[PDB]
Amino acid sequence: HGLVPRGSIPALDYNPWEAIQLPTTATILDMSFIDRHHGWLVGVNATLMETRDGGQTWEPRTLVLDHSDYRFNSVSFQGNEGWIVGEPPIMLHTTDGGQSWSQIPLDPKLPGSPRLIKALGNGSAEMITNVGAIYRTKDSGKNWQALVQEAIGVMRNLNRSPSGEYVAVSSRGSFYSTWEPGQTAWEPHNRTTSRRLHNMGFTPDGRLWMIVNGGKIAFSDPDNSENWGELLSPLRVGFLDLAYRTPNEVWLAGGAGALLCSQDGGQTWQQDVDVKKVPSNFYKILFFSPDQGFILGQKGILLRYVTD
């Protein structure tokens, strides 16, 4: 499996990723860690699993819900306080590291369905819905206040910056929108390529990155977050996520076992050929530290970063 022919892009000398099969065929959608060893992952069909060895092994945790059809979209821990949101609207909360969980009934006025929750610690969190509504709680989810008043269309692939900014691609990739605290509305931006936008996020140096249709990426101008550099073609395949491990080491995950690494901040790319054996799209890269990282696949497949 995964034999790559001569003439491909240069190969990485080393493979730091190990494939793990979870005790499920459910697709995993998000993961969050309390500390270096204790973490949680969530996915489709209300899948919830816990690790206590840093993600080498995972155990399912039983929940008693009214049904098991929920898609758990996002999980976030800050210390022992953890939150999960999913669709159709559901929110779960823990204050003891996930020993016990409570369902927080969501106000039926909630606009759209939850797509992301961010734990801020000590009773605070913010939640974003697929229509770009943003709500903050400070009292463990009893009350929520809107942080934005207005938006356009359905958002996709929400990403949050270290300072609490958000960027989102529209549901058809025709444009993207940004928001930062104090804005009453998202601000939409026209895309700069013919190719439809698939995903966008933040670099560790205050820029945006974007993945566009046809296996191309680009980075915004440091002088001007609204000017974009030249389109790059890492593989000369569609890409699904991009994530930094360090300021200069970038990983780029795509369909059918495609996984590339750049050690020069995105200038040149090398293929991790070893993971091409694994029969899965790579949907999402999560680095929790320079040493600890996971890639979410299908059918209960994860890749785990081993420090080497």
């Binding site: 008693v64 779960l92 369902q103 009934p105 006025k109 009350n143 929520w144 809107a146 008043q149």
Partner: peptide, 18 residues
């Protein structure tokens, strides 16, 4: 489609699920 969002939400009391 433009949307205008409720400014405040409130949650009923939580129920244990685990």
């Amino acid at each position: 489609n433009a949307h205008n969002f409720p400014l405040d939400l409130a949650s009923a009391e939580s129920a244990p699920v685990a």
